[PDB]
Design a binder for this molecule. Structure first.
Ligand SMILES: [Zn+2]
Length: 46
Protein backbone atom coordinates (compact mmCIF):
# COMPACT_ATOMS: atom_id res chain seq x y z
CA UNK A 1 0.00 0.00 0.00
CA UNK A 2 1.58 3.32 1.05
CA UNK A 3 -0.05 4.93 -2.02
CA UNK A 4 0.16 8.59 -0.96
CA UNK A 5 2.79 9.86 1.51
CA UNK A 6 3.20 8.20 4.93
CA UNK A 7 3.08 10.49 7.99
CA UNK A 8 6.48 9.88 9.61
CA UNK A 9 4.50 10.09 12.87
CA UNK A 10 1.34 7.99 12.41
CA UNK A 11 1.73 6.98 8.72
CA UNK A 12 -1.51 8.83 7.91
CA UNK A 13 -1.45 8.80 4.09
CA UNK A 14 -4.92 10.36 3.74
CA UNK A 15 -4.13 13.82 5.14
CA UNK A 16 -5.61 16.84 3.37
CA UNK A 17 -2.16 18.48 3.09
CA UNK A 18 1.34 17.19 3.92
CA UNK A 19 4.02 19.39 5.54
CA UNK A 20 7.72 18.65 6.15
CA UNK A 21 9.80 20.15 8.98
CA UNK A 22 13.53 20.61 9.69
CA UNK A 23 13.78 16.85 9.10
CA UNK A 24 11.90 17.15 5.79
CA UNK A 25 9.35 14.62 7.10
CA UNK A 26 5.68 14.52 6.07
CA UNK A 27 3.38 14.73 9.12
CA UNK A 28 -0.37 14.47 8.37
CA UNK A 29 -1.71 17.33 10.53
CA UNK A 30 -2.10 16.81 14.31
CA UNK A 31 1.26 14.98 14.49
CA UNK A 32 3.05 18.32 13.93
CA UNK A 33 0.83 20.32 16.33
CA UNK A 34 3.38 19.49 19.06
CA UNK A 35 6.34 20.87 17.07
CA UNK A 36 4.20 24.00 16.54
CA UNK A 37 3.71 24.90 20.22
CA UNK A 38 5.98 22.44 22.04
CA UNK A 39 8.62 22.42 19.28
CA UNK A 40 9.76 18.94 20.38
CA UNK A 41 9.00 15.70 18.50
CA UNK A 42 5.78 13.67 18.85
CA UNK A 43 5.77 10.53 20.99
CA UNK A 44 3.06 8.32 19.44
CA UNK A 45 3.34 4.52 19.64
CA UNK A 46 4.49 1.68 17.36
ZN1 LIG B 1 0.21 11.76 11.49
Amino acid sequence: GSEARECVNCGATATPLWRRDRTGHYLCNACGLYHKMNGQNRPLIR
